[PDB]
Amino acid sequence: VVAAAEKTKQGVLYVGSKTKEGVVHGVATVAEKTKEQVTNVGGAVVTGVTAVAQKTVEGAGSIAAATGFVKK
């Protein structure tokens, strides 16, 4: 799990949201009368009504993610 980023040197961004009665649930877990469960999140969960990503990367960007599940 190695991440690196380097940068060497030698407009209008409009988001308009007009909603009404917005109900958002990003990560939900409902367990009833069960025995064993695992909710494993290790990446990126984005939830919205107006989910906007403008000009996310304009330089050095590097996201390193890893998940592990071992059950011996």
- 8 to 27, contacts with its own copies by CB under 8 A? 8-27
Interaction mask 51-70, its own copies, x per CB under 8 A: xxxxxxxxxxxxxxxxxxxx
**What is the C-alpha to C-alpha distance for residues 14 and 55, in angstroms, rounded to an integer?**
12
Nearest to 38 by CA among 47, 29, 48: 29
The residues, ordered by sequence, that sit 6+ positions from 64 with a Cβ below 8 Å of its Cβ are: 1, 2, 3
Which residues between 34 and 53 bind its own copies (CB under 8 A)? 34-53
43 a known binding residue? Answer: no
CB 5 within 8 A of CB 61: yes
Instruction: Tell me the closest approach of the beta carbon of residue 21 to its own copies, in angstroms.
Output: 5
Could you list the residues known to form a binding site for Cu cation, using ranges. 25
